[PDB]
Design a protein around this nucleic acid. Sequence first.
RNA 1: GUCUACGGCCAUACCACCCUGAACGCGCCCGAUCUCGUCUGAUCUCGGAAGCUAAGCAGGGUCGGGCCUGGUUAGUACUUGGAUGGGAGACCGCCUGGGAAUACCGGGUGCUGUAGGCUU
RNA 2: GAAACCUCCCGUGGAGCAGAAGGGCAAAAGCUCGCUUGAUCUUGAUUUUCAGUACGAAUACAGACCGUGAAAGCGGGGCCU
RNA 3: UAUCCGGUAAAGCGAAUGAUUAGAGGUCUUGGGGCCGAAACGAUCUCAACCUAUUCUCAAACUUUAAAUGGGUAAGAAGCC
Lengths: 159, 204, 292, 169
Amino acid sequence: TNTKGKRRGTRYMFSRPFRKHGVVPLATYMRIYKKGDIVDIKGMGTVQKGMPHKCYHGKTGRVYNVTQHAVGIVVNKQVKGKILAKRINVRIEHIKHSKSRDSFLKRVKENDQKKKEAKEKGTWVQLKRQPAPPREAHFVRTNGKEPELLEPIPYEFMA
Amino acid sequence: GRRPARCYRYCKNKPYPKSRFCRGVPDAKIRIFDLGRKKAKVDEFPLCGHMVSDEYEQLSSEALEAARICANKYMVKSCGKDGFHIRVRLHPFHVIRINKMLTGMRGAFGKPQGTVARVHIGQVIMSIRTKLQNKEHVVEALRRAKFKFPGRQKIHISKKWGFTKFNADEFEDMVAEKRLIPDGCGVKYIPNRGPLDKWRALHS
Amino acid sequence: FVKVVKNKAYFKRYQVKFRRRREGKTDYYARKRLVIQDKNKYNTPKYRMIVRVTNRDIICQIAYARIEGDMIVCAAYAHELPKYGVKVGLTNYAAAYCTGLLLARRLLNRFGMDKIYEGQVEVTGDEYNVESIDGQPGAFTCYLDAGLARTTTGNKVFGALKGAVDGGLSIPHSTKRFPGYDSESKEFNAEVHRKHIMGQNVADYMRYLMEEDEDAYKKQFSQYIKNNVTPDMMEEMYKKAHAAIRENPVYEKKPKREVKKKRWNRPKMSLAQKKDRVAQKKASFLRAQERA
Amino acid sequence: ENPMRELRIRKLCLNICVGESGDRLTRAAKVLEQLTGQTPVFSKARYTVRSFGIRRNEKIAVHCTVRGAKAEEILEKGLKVREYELRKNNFSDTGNFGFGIQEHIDLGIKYDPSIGIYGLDFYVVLGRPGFSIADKKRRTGCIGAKHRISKEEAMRWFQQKYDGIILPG
RNA sequence: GUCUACGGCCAUACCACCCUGAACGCGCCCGAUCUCGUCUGAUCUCGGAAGCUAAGCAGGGUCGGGCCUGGUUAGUACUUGGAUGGGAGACCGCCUGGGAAUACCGGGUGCUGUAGGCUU
RNA sequence: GAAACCUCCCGUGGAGCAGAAGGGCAAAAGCUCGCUUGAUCUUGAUUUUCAGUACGAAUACAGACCGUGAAAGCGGGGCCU
RNA sequence: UAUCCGGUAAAGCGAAUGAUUAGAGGUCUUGGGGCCGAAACGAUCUCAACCUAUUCUCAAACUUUAAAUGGGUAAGAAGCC
Ligand SMILES: [Mg+2]
Ligand SMILES: [Mg+2]
Ligand SMILES: [Mg+2]
Ligand SMILES: [Mg+2]
Ligand SMILES: [Mg+2]
Ligand SMILES: [Mg+2]
Ligand SMILES: [Mg+2]
Ligand SMILES: [Mg+2]
Ligand SMILES: [Mg+2]
Ligand SMILES: [Mg+2]
Ligand SMILES: [Mg+2]
């Protein structure tokens, strides 16, 4: 049977990457988390106060509280059969903004631009995304030179 | 005394090297991994006869010794005492365990019985270099040493000069310009890169 | 000979420290504490009154910290004090005071709080601090960033602090390290401090040297003697400067133009040139050796 | 025609390692006080050594650094006792030199049956202008390269300045 | 062209040695009355401005080390899913999709924010 | 004298941080001084084991009274497990 | 389709840690044994450890690298302005 210890099996998780030990660069500390900001937790060995538990490493979640130098953050955790949205207080240093959401915001901004325009025109434009379709009919010009013949090569034992 | 080789043939376990953890390991039978005229220059031994494995199996330290002796004995009788160099290229690192029975299967976890080398398919076991005269005697020397191993291994004559990494067709040309430079059994490869004072030692 | 301490391996595993830490300027331990905000303040700034004493200069800046790089709201230098009255001794405590005052006034004119928050005018030296007036825009608040200065009693950093405080910035401070505080008794004078503010410690040393030996005085205070700045002319000089600062702190720069645009430096040697150079050295080495 | 590559004395260092503690050491401090004109410092042991008869944190030696003119003066005295002879090995590779004196009364001090005869150890740290960079607080640095004092360069300074011989062997 | 102050990212910025630095700066530098602190004005603190770029610092250099980024290694190693495929086993081949890492060979060698100089 | 003390140089940490081991740590989290009792008083929230009950152990706050520091701050025990 | 997380396979050890073969080079150190030396870093070997480039082979409780399969988020009216 295994030990229930908090930091069991975080020999590699909470360990600063190669040649990135030492001082935590300050941008980290000086960027603002509001309420409802989606945020991806990722523990960090240096700062040991306010570490999140190993289960939430990798997990992303939304911010619901903002204390002085920590941020309450609702995350989903699975537990055998049931997923539990649960709220953890992680000190800033173990937290980044999840870029996941930003590509969506860009796309909404592009749709709003393309909805204001093309209304006075009349031409309705494709707003939805669409999966990468089959790659269309097209000509291939073997310009002058013929194609190159490829024999499979005869075996030989190298080692 | 010890077990049959049968039981410890297949590469079943994770590698269990002699370390902090695994201690009280009795020493390997094989010790001298090379013999012949090992104090010989690159140019006076180009042939490179390997014994290459064809199974993912474990060779015992005892086997490797017996194979070496076998190959060396015949090499000496054949060509001469100082007309070859044989490099064994599998050291037994992996330790091999032995639950002994005078309780039953309770608390069974072995003491170290001995050591063993793990060999991959296509990996070299033994290797010999000598002269272009002496190809036949090398082949038979390795052939004989096959009989001291389990599984199946091919004997193969390389396209490399000696024990170098450099194709024998290109070797002599690379030496004369000074891409390559003699270095005991080995040969140091000089590249472009290094400060120009290194270049000035050569070409002078 | 010995084992080479700095191998390939050494460099391979080696981590450099931050640039400003290498350069020997920024104490990142202190900077973290100084500069970051409480997150629940959010995007409100946290200003620091930076003070840095150079060999011939005193710089005072006010700056908050943004992620792109801490931005400077306002700055005052010692080499501006010639405008206001102070000719000499610009790295000295009294000038440090003036610089800090000048800074504070300049900041206050930007936010229209020049008329509000006059601060301390008479220059006592005592514990002063600015209460924010009700029904009026609150006092500016910043913290003193000393840097790598060994903050001991009578450090010119705190001189600049005093000047700024008297200028009307709510900077927190004790008076434990204003020159005047006694370590072996634990009370403040604030007359001793006053003297230091108005260069009397310099004046007295100027008087003491003239009494003792003319030659040393002439050497020590050459640029003081030039420009005609006597011991008894000192206190007045600083008081005039303070009044000139108070009346108009604004900076106008100089309209810089008419530049030739030429390279003082040496440009970086192109690949091809470097590639050529080695070939010439090789050739040169060959032709030279084919003789002897 | 060099400007400020003027090999000077950065500091002179002095120590009397009695390895006894208590009274002998305090008695030796007085000698250093008489010589230098400044209170010295007691250095305590790094660790116990039963052979030498010392214990961890026990006071073994007394030492003192002197700088400037006083250092120059005391260095001169030391060389006079030694008779202006040093060896090749007496100079360090870093461009410093040192030498013992077998009894302090040769410099210019009176003996006493109590305050006996402490021999001592002159070590001269040479330097140059702009050597402070290494040990200042803020914008530190290394002292270039063509600036560091070689063993040879210190030897020729000593040969010139104090008219020394530098005997071989 | 470039510097100073406070910086962001933290080696394309590190290390070694070599060369060159106008003006302003940055420095070394010269002092210890006061402040402050030392066994020691070396550091620290303070008052200066007679020298000097020797050093720091900047820019450049080296068929330089290092680091960064491509190729190669190699569709190799490994690998998701599949078969009443092979093989005595060990293991291997095929299908279906995914696909690395050294050695070896090239190129690059700080970018840039705010505020203030100088080259008027 | 291989080992006492002093001095110069190199030194990415190869030392040290009570203990097992792992992580973490260099103008520190190490060492040496200076002053101290945040190892104090008091509500809830949360995390970890989890049944998502306890205990223990921890995290973020909030209200007091204090310490320290020029100050920003840091501190309601032990760098974290 | 975006975007985080990961340290297993593989790989690596001319990169750290630990293991480990060989010769080239080195009075680095110094030795213990020699042979030629009274003795001599003298000459000549030698074996110890250390080092300068190379070389052989390794790691469940090593690792600079680093997959496949895999785990979070996100893809709008509880949204934009
Ligand atoms: Mg049997
Ligand atoms: Mg097994
Ligand atoms: Mg500090
Ligand atoms: Mg001085
Ligand atoms: Mg210079
Ligand atoms: Mg120069
Ligand atoms: Mg390079
Ligand atoms: Mg409280
Ligand atoms: Mg502690
Ligand atoms: Mg694992
Ligand atoms: Mg593996």
